[PDB]
Amino acid sequence: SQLLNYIDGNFVTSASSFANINPVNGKLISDVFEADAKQVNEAVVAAQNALKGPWGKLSVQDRAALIHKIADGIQARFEEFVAAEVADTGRPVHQARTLDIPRAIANFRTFADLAKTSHTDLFEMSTSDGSGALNYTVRKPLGVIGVISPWNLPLLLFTWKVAPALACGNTVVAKPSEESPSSATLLAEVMHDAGVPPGVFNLIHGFGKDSAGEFLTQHPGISALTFTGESKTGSTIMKAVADGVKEVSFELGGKNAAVVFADADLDAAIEGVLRSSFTNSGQVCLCSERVYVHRSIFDEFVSGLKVEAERLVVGYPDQDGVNMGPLISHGHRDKVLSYYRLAVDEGATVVTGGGVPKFNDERDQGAYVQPTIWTGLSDKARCVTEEIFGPVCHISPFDDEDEVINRVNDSNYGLACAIWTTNLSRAHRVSRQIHVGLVWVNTWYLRDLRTPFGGVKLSGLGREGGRFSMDFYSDIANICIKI
Amino acid sequence: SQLLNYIDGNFVTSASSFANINPVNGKLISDVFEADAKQVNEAVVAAQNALKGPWGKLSVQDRAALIHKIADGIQARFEEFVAAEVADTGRPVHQARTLDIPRAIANFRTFADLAKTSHTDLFEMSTSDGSGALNYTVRKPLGVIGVISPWNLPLLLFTWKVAPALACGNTVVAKPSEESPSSATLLAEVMHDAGVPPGVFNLIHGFGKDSAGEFLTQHPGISALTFTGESKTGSTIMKAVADGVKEVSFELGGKNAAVVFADADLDAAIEGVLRSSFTNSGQVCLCSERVYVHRSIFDEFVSGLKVEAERLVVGYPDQDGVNMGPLISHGHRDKVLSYYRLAVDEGATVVTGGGVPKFNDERDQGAYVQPTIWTGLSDKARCVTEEIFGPVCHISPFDDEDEVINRVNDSNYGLACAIWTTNLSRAHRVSRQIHVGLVWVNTWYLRDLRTPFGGVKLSGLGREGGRFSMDFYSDIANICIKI
Amino acid sequence: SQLLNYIDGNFVTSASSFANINPVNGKLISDVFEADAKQVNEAVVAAQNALKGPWGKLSVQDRAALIHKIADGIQARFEEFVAAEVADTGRPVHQARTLDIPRAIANFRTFADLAKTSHTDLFEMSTSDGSGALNYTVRKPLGVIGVISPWNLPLLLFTWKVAPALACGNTVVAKPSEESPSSATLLAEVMHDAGVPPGVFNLIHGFGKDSAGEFLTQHPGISALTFTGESKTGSTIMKAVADGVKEVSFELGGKNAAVVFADADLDAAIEGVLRSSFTNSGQVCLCSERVYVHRSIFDEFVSGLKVEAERLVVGYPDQDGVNMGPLISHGHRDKVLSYYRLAVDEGATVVTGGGVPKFNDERDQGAYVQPTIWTGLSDKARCVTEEIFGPVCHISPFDDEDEVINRVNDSNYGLACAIWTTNLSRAHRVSRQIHVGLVWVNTWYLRDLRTPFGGVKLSGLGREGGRFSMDFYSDIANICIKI
Amino acid sequence: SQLLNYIDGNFVTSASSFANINPVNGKLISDVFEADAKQVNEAVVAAQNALKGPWGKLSVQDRAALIHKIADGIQARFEEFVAAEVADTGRPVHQARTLDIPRAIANFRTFADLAKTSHTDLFEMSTSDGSGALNYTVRKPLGVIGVISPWNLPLLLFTWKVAPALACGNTVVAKPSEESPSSATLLAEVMHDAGVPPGVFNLIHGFGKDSAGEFLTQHPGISALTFTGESKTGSTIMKAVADGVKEVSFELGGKNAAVVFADADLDAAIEGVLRSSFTNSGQVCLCSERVYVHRSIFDEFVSGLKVEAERLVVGYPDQDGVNMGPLISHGHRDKVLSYYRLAVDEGATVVTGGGVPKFNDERDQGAYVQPTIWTGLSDKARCVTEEIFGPVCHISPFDDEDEVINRVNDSNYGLACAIWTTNLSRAHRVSRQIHVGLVWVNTWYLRDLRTPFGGVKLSGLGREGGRFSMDFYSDIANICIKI
Ligand SMILES: NC(=O)c1ccc[n+]([C@@H]2O[C@H](COP(=O)([O-])OP(=O)(O)OC[C@H]3O[C@@H](n4cnc5c(N)ncnc54)[C@H](O)[C@@H]3O)[C@@H](O)[C@H]2O)c1
Ligand SMILES: NC(=O)c1ccc[n+]([C@@H]2O[C@H](COP(=O)([O-])OP(=O)(O)OC[C@H]3O[C@@H](n4cnc5c(N)ncnc54)[C@H](O)[C@@H]3O)[C@@H](O)[C@H]2O)c1
Ligand SMILES: *C(=O)/C=C/C=C(\O)C(=O)O
Ligand SMILES: *C(=O)/C=C/C=C(\O)C(=O)O
Ligand code: NA
Ligand code: NA
Ligand code: NA
Ligand code: NA
């Protein structure tokens, strides 16, 4: 497979290519052409020009119809996108079929609909002469949106940004993770086939520092940079755009906690924490890598989770009953296993997992690790405070509600939290005190696309979703008429 | 000993003081104690702790009531605030009495009221199991808000940030401009007398780089930094908070245009542009330093404006009929005069002004300049493209509507624009094509505090005002209940 | 052709039928089975029951998709719907193709989208015990919506009610005008073929008093009655539902004015008033039957409008260049002609029209009248104060802006007004003073479906459109959780 | 003591008067002049005129400040208002001090605040010529609001309607209950002393039918009628305004249930149903006259409530620990006692009360009744299906969740419901299935004034509160500008 850039209506190669590797077996899947600085310029300039072309003349209704046409395009190639997403990342086929590709479709449809329904405000005011004035606001395209996305939910996160950007009339220069370039490239094909005017959507491949990613953030021609990824990368991009004072929107992961209270449905909570720790092999920014369980049910909770975790099938994306594929790459697995070691050095008890499974086939050339549970670490351990981004959790007992709220909040991060309790007052009382952008009670990662999505502290800045995306991806302009 | 810091409920001095100069005559008004890094730490920690004190326990109704009491406290000492604002800045006593102090009181009242009325959102969704779920959002205090304000509308802009910060339940560490520290110090005494709990509002004095401003900016304990001032300082601040990924809100001035079309009420447009160019001696981020006038009325407009500008009385804040005071400082005076010279060098015709008036009294030791009108420069002239922040405007003819719209938008800034026209279609057609955050038609700087206020490009990031401030100064949290 | 009721998923006849007459030539088009009280009761009960079936279990997104399927079904038979609407009413084919059927399809799509995007409110509050409470609101189906619609824009107005009813999860019993039953019956076929569950949508044919309309109105099983038609009829319906305290929504026509100021674009105003007076042969609740024109342009406006009126082609629905078809029925024509003589008796100058065209072919057996302009009546003339609902307008001069505002507002109706002026202040200053639900400036009947649509005084009560429909066709419930 | 009408800024007598009776002892408190038809017309005409006077030139800020001055004026005479409401109704001094008078003050403050903060909508749209159009909406005063209020919470309910009416710029003609005219007459003095312009607020005394109530209702000069009281009276008023098609808003009582599930905090539920049944001697539209208790806790619950009920002190309004005053009147006690008898006829077990207390003093000439509890009635009994409006409740056991939901909903009414449960899923799952306007979980009659308030079925029409009031008491006008 060859994966090219898509710049100003055309697919183009580059001076340099890099390998896309399948993490299931270590095999080469494709050569990917790295955009250089010149090509990034070309994309941004094309994006700037396209804003003054046909795209800029479309009614909101026409624009929304075309975006639905994009989403029809993905649906018409549904299985091709499933296969591309699975090949890049090793994620289970059922996950790609139920979470990944459908969400990418729903992202475009949801924001296409919002572009049609959304309106703005009218404020009337008195003036000293008695004639009054009126202020009204409009939303306009911000301009060229730079989009930089990660490899953990490639098409979902890539379209989570591209859909609202296009729905708001912007043009886009978008750079997918070098680890998972395939579905974004098929998306370029869908755009092209749907007749999206040239320059409106541009796809550039490559890495971050000293590559397409960095060149994007440094380009004076963009009006905003939306990014999901590692928190320190957020800081770097924020510095990079500072001289342009570009608008920024960041979701930057975290060190999320699950809390299980004594009145929880215990079997429900065990299954739910199994899902929150090990979904996508723990490679969701929302995963619970810290878990607090009331002392009175701690042992029974830990025993039950150990049993469920050792029932997880780890293997081929299409394997019967598969629950976990590999990590995204050998590089990421190096990081995760170095934390597996660190946990033991910090004095953890390894409840289950802690290494890599032996398959006695090509999966041994892949990037698999075992689902892993720890117990016995202090709230200050590095494995309990630093984002690992693997299929792991540490479990600790607690006694008191105010105490556990403090321990959950005692973090430089604050993206998400999951709480288990059957008690009505506790759900609402505790949830509002957790210092994060997203709380789930008796579930996890349940998404209504209209809700504000973002984190606090090192976990991000701004919110996206619903009207928060409609506001971020638009110039909000106030027009005051003296009457 | 004159102007003290206010930290954790105590007025405190510092190791070093600096002079506050009266720009009317260059005399010393007061010594101001410069907060050092330790004192800035102390203020941030105290604000962090106050979030856990009784301030954090107030209901929204009680918090609002207390904010109204701060406003009452300003009103109670109205004329003292006027005298402080006038002493620091030389602004006309009438301006301080009508624009500055009332706006500051209205800032607290409007955001107190919005604190009580504002509400959030309820989203219902279906789920696989048929029982559904609820997402609802809440606003919570962001935490400690760092406020850095400029010297041009001292109390107005300082309260513009402090009022919504308090209304949203935050605590505050605020650093007013070294040039105009008096009214913010009186506001501290007002907070004290009102019984605002210690730590909730903290005042630190000093400069930017290597002083209280830089320190505030780099402190890990703040949750956001809101700033009004020069764009390049905005960029410095954006880099400073980047490692903490702190929320940011910037309004950074610009090079604003006024446009007068042939069908304007000519007398009103001349009066309007006289106000937009010379109010506060041209020291408002919203002033029109570039003016475009349809060729059919260009000479008449220039003639009329010249006559009106030369009627302006430049003098004492309590001078009979006074229109303009001095610039804020000799240092700012030097910048402005550097531009007055550059304008001649760039080939400008000096319709009026272009130097400093000769008063033959103590005003000669202050920082006055003349209101100045230029003509004959090209759209690329430095004097036409760089923010001067003085009482000056260049006037250029135009012929076509699409032409003038392009020349207005050909700028790295985009804060505000004023359009003069009596034509219904043109007003709405042209206003929506101007790439700024704020357009006024047939008026200027007419303010409804509910409206989104901010700029595009180098002129800012984000919006404040109304629900935009309620959002920026709050954590927006989403809570999802599985049923 | 025979037109059946549709009740509980089955097309059914009745003991009695009535004739559907083509107003172009007076010929019989169809027999229509009249629903009796007994069949009305079956529809209401089937609708109640359908709330507890599969319909009531659809997620909002699934309900919206099925509603888009209804719209797809109409589109798939677009030309059949065009032919049906034309046959019943005589409207020009081009109007059916551009206004009527497209708006019916748009009505369903607009409200299906609003069903997906709309959300409700979250209010937090403090309590005595310091634990606080939460109030959240939800939208639920009101229950069974009774829909009674008029003959002037049959499918347009029929679906304007049925679309939001269904979108909000209600079930429906709908009674279209006896003059225009055909497209409603086609809509019933589309609903059936789309798989809309039995009892969700019920179509009952008949008249008002002592027939289907009245019986629907009197049935205790409905939860609301939405109605567009004659004002006195709205009053009757309001009395009929009073004992059940049913929710009601009425749009009741009016005696709308157009105002042409001295600075109007005269040719555009002539064309605009031509359209506002004579569209659909003046059979729109929104038509201008009163026109005020500034004295300085009155003679030229009257002359220009006479020319354009006499250029209108009055003829067959598919005749080349046709502008106007007949009135809906002989009965309506008797009413209109009655007013035409009354105008003469009241002292009117007949500028043009005032009678019936003579075709010397089968159209003479139809229900045609001529477009008619009057001049010289006083503001108290009956022909200036009572809604005629034919292709007529009276034109009167004025001198003063406040004067004409008073004359427009001096009416027992207040549905719409159209104003013509090129002046920015005038447009906003005048529009806000007109006591109507809807003002247009320099256009007429330009519809954005998100806007509140409705009248004041005798012209209606309640608003529909956008969120106004979502609120009216829903129970709004507040749920207060003590924490 | 005399109570006059207040019309066009003047207190005026009438050709007739009637007795205001203290229900504690049947002693005459004052004579009340009964406005006649001529006087009502004079009030409506004065309110109509005042719309064009100084009231109507008020900015929204200035109008709100005057409204707050009205509130201040009530606070300034707080104890007098307390005394007037007690005298009229016999309510405990304590309830008047904490519930009635402060809520009346909060009603004006909350709507004055809303008046300042509320804004409207801007919708942009494409047009066929490519220039587009703008639709913006505005709120204007509806006109003259007719207000008719009941005697159970005289000032609270009088001001609940009057406050938003005035906050929206309307003028008011208000008719308080014949049983409780005092606090409203004091309000008129406050309005007057506050400088409220003549004609803005008019107070007319009298009864319903054939008196000031009915006359208001039939007057063609009002624009709306807002009413809280008996459901049949709402049906009467709806017919009365129907010929003018006036806007109507009704809150019409009900037969509200409380539901106590087995996992309720039993003690809390016992206390909560005590309050919900006997507050204001059960004369609240919101009281729980039907209570369902899970079978497993039924006997315990009844036992507990009997004991708490017999603890209640029934006596003088100022009497030591008084919990209950008398009924409002003798006529009303007759109605209630008649239900006490019917309960027995219908076969009910009297757990407690069921008659009148015996004082051996002036109170024996009052209108006291005992707090009563019944058991053993069927769901169809008249005592369990008809509004008594006394301090009575019937308690019935239930077994299943879906069962009790069906029984709660099996009512021609639907105002409020209180649910008791500690379970998170149940509380949300059950609350949304109750067919009422208002649900409380684990509390009762907890009021956030921003929330929508109203009932379904016979219990009302429309919603009031927050923006629902701002919309009902305003004309919503849409203004569409073609560009
Ligand atoms: N947007 C406005 O309203 C506004 C206001 C004042 C000045 N200006 C512009 O800025 C120019 C210079 O004036 P100025 O020097 O007072 O503006 P400045 O932006 O440098 O300083 C304004 C505020 O920022 C603080 N500050 C400065 N440097 C900082 C730093 N490195 N870190 C943290 N805080 C810092 C200052 O102490 C002051 O409170 C003017 O000529 C004008 O062009 C704009
Ligand atoms: N607002 C509008 O758009 C509109 C539309 C049509 C007619 N009108 C006015 O009404 C006049 C007469 O026309 P029309 O008789 O067809 O209008 P109408 O108001 O009497 O009837 C319209 C609809 O209401 C039904 N209806 C009539 N009486 C009823 C009753 N007592 N109970 C229940 N339903 C009833 C009809 O069957 C039809 O479906 C026209 O001349 C015109 O002035 C207004
Ligand atoms: C009345 O004759 C016209 C009604 C039109 C509407 O209701 C509409 O939505 O356009
Ligand atoms: C009915 O008896 C009580 C009504 C209460 C209100 O309307 C309220 O605002 O609290
Ligand atoms: Na890969
Ligand atoms: Na100074
Ligand atoms: Na017909
Ligand atoms: Na009484």
Residue numbers in the entry:
A (entry chain A), B (entry chain B), C (entry chain D), D (entry chain C): 18 to 500
The authors write:
Enzyme–NAD+ binary complex crystals were soaked in mother liquor containing 2-HMS for a range of time points from 5 min to more than 3 h before flash cooling in liquid nitrogen. In a crystal that was soaked for 40 min, an intermediate was trapped and refined to a resolution of 1.95 Å. In this structure, 2-HMS is observed in the 2Z, 4E isomer rather than the 2E, 4E isomer as seen in the substrate-bound ternary structure. Also, the substrate interacts with Arg120 and Arg464 with both of its carboxyl oxygens rather than one carboxyl oxygen and the 2-hydroxy oxygen as shown in the 2-HMS ternary complex structure. On E to Z isomerization, the carbon chain of the substrate extends, and the distance between its sixth carbon and Cys302’s sulfur is now at 1.8 Å, which is within covalent bond distance for a carbon–sulfur bond. Also, the continuous electron density between Cys302-SG and 2-HMS-C6 indicates the presence of a covalent bond. Another feature of this intermediate is that the nicotinamide ring of NAD+ has moved 4.6 Å away from the active site and adopted a bent conformation compared with the position in the binary or ternary complex structures. Thus, the coenzyme in this intermediate structure is likely to have been reduced to NADH and, as such, the structure is assigned as a thioacyl-enzyme–substrate adduct. Another notable change in the intermediate structure is the movement of the side chain of Glu268, which rotates 73° towards the active site. In the thioacyl intermediate structure, the electron density of Glu268 becomes very well defined again, but its side chain rotates 73° towards the bound substrate and seems to be in an ‘active’ position to abstract a proton from a deacylating water.
One enzyme in particular, 2-aminomuconate-6-semialdehyde dehydrogenase (AMSDH), is responsible for oxidizing the unstable metabolic intermediate 2-aminomuconate-6-semialdehyde (2-AMS) to 2-aminomuconate (2-AM). On the basis of sequence alignment, AMSDH is a member of the hydroxymuconic-semialdehyde dehydrogenase (HMSDH) family under the aldehyde dehydrogenase (ALDH) superfamily. The complete AMSDH model includes four polypeptides per asymmetric unit describing one homotetramer. Each monomer of AMSDH contains three domains: a subunit interaction domain, a catalytic domain and an NAD+ binding domain.
